[PDB]
Each structure stands twice: as C-alpha cells, then as structure tokens.
Assembly symmetry: D2
C-alpha cells in the first residue's frame, strides 16, 4: 500500500470519518489527471488507493475534501479543501502516508515517507 491518507478531527478528538479524498497526477501536458479516490474509514484511514505498479514517479496532488466533511456535520468551515502536492518515487519506490488534522478554520498536514 504505497499511498495512504490518515485524518484526525481536532474538535471531536476522534478520527475524521468519511472524508473524501481525490488524488491527481500531473500529466505530460501539465494538467491534473484523476489518479485515484476514496474515503476515510471509521479509523480515519484510507487504504487501497493505488498499487506499487500504478504509483509511478510523478507530481501528485492529494485533495482532502474538508469542506464536504464539515458541511456533512452541519458546520460551515473556512477552506474549500486541503491540497497536498508532492513529487513521489523520484529516488525509487517509497511508501507515503499523508496525515492531516482538521479544525473548521485550520488544518495541519505532514508526510511520513518510508523505504520498504
């Protein structure tokens, strides 16, 4: 599982459940091409986005749909989404965890990059 997303909720002190995530890869023409999507589980984790074979070098954008998450809880948040944009696998295959911590007017994000 080379690309995982984990999301926590800083208001409830809980995993952020049912957060939609869309991943894009920058194409040869410099547009954002849809790559994978999913939503976080009861643990706040999203597994199974991609495979080792399909997760090639490139510039990836992980869009975390924070506004849809907060609106679904009936909260009117500030941001449209949280975008995490990075070059992946340029030194060979790595495993990436994109972690995020959400509040209605703020988010934090970090990356955990490991070499299998």
């Amino acid at each position: 599982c080379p690309l995982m997303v984990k999301v926590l909720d800083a208001v409830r002190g809980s995993p952020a459940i049912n957060v939609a995530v869309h991943v894009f890869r920058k194409a040869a023409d410099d547009t954002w091409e849809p790559f994978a999507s999913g939503k976080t589980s009861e643990s706040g984790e999203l597994h199974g986005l991609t495979t080792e074979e399909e997760f090639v070098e490139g510039i990836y954008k992980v869009e975390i749909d924070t506004k849809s998450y907060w609106k679904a809880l009936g909260i009117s948040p500030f941001h449209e989404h949280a975008e995490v944009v990075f070059t992946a696998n340029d030194s060979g295959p790595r495993r990436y965890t994109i972690a995020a911590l959400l509040s209605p007017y703020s988010y934090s994000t970090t990356a955990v990059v490991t070499n299998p």
Copy 2:
C-alpha cells in the same frame, strides 16, 4: 487591507522571509485567474495584495512557494508548494489573514477573519 498572508518557519523559529506568494481568483470557467502576488517581508508578512474594491466574493487560492524557500536555505523539502483555498463571503468579517507555519515535511495553516 482585506487580505494578508503571514508565514512562519518552525525549523529556525523565525518569520519565513522572501517567500513568493501568488493569489488567484476562480473564474467563471473554473480556471485560476492571477489576482495578486508578492514576497513576504522581514516579518514574514505580505501586505497590500488588494483593495476593498478589487476583493469581491468568490473562491481564492493562495499559493506559497515553500519548495524555493527551503532550497534557498539548503534544505530538501517534501511539498511542491502550499496551497490555501477558501471562499471570501461578505457576511463574515471583512479582513482575512492567511497564516502558515512551515516545516520541511509539514505545514499548518489557519485563517484569522476579523471586523
């Protein structure tokens, strides 16, 4: 000053100085139209991006060129840039501060919306 950007460095414990910041407004066709840009000051602040007259309701994107900032300090960073995307809504208070706190593999951002 309806829109301000303030950038801090969590490695050095300092303002993030001479960071490039580009602001875009979402157009009718869903493209990002250049809106304003500048470099953060010695205090990590970028003032004077827009006026009340130009800053209408809509969706704005603040792109912070974090990758150049880290490489100029000799540090290998994770992100291509930091993007903050939000709706300006007359209704809420009228002054927007977008604040960001940078580390090589992480950033935090918050909004301070007042008056």
Copy 3:
C-alpha cells in the same frame, strides 16, 4: 518587549480573546516562581509582560488557560491548560514570541525569535 504571547482560535478563525496567561521562571530549587501574567487582547496578543532588565536567562513556563477559554464559549475541551516551556538564551535573538493555535482537542505552538 522581550516576551510576547499570541493566541489564535482554529474553530472560529479569530484571535483568542481574554485568555488568561501565566508566566513562571524556574527557581534554583526547581519550583516555578510567578513572573508575569495577563489576558490576551482583542487581537489575541499579550504585550508588556516584562522588561529587558527583568527577563534574564533561564527556563520559563507560559501557561495558557485554554480550558476556561473553551468553557466560556460553551465548548467542552480536552486539556486542563496549554504549557510552553523553553530556555531564554542571550546568544540567540533577543525578542521571543510564543504563538499558540487552539482547538478543543488539540493545540499547536511555535516560537518566533528575532533581533
């Protein structure tokens, strides 16, 4: 102003107003000696805690009364308080800003050390 505290609210997107802040200095016997205190302003800032003459090298603790802040807004918070503990070192720059960003179950803090 050698020491400043700046508190922001990540739920409302605003300064954290009228937060109690207590500053202590570690004494020779490892106890915390009261040093300075105040409430954050309308801008979430607390200025004028100390002078250059009183602010000597040593270990300081900044205690932010986050629990009272949240309860006064009708919100149930996790922490008893937020504590920021650091050494003041003449060597490094001379002005310390302790900044905190508050949520009910979380906080972030950074230092901005300049001049």
Copy 4:
C-alpha cells in the same frame, strides 16, 4: 492499552523514534506523582504504559521529552518538552492516544479519545 503516545518528525518526514515520555498523575496533595514512562518505537508509537486497572480517573500529564530527542540528533531545539495535561476517565474508562508532530521550534499535539 488505554494510554498510547504517537510522535512524528516534521523535518525528516518519519516517525519520531526513541522519544522518551514520562506520565504523571496529580496526587491527593496536588503534586505530580510519577505514573509511567517509556519511549517511542521504530513506528513512533509507545504502547504498554499502563493497564485498564491502574489507569484510574485523575489529571494526567504526558511529558514528551522533545529537547532530549532533538539533542540526540545533534539539533539545538527551542522547547524543554511538550506537556499534555488532561482529565482522564471522568465519564468512565476511555482509550487515549496523545499524538504529537515535532519541529525544532514548534510542536502540534492532538488527542484521540475512544470508548471501547
């Protein structure tokens, strides 16, 4: 495992390994009594601090020894430690994860509180 600590490193993009953690509980006399201690593993996680039986109601302080962590990497950091102080189990037993994200001049911390 009712009390866990997880720590990430925002500079290296990695778990924060070998972080010492000391937990205190406020005693009847209002002093901080040592309760448990340990250090984070290769995953950045610290398990096995306490038991359900021993983790009674109280006010707990989780001290994360950030200065010792950064000095052991030869970095001179700002903070002495990161203290996380909270009331636990006042509505019955819960499971607490104290998560932290470290930089030399900054840290974030959040709590994940679940009901078994």
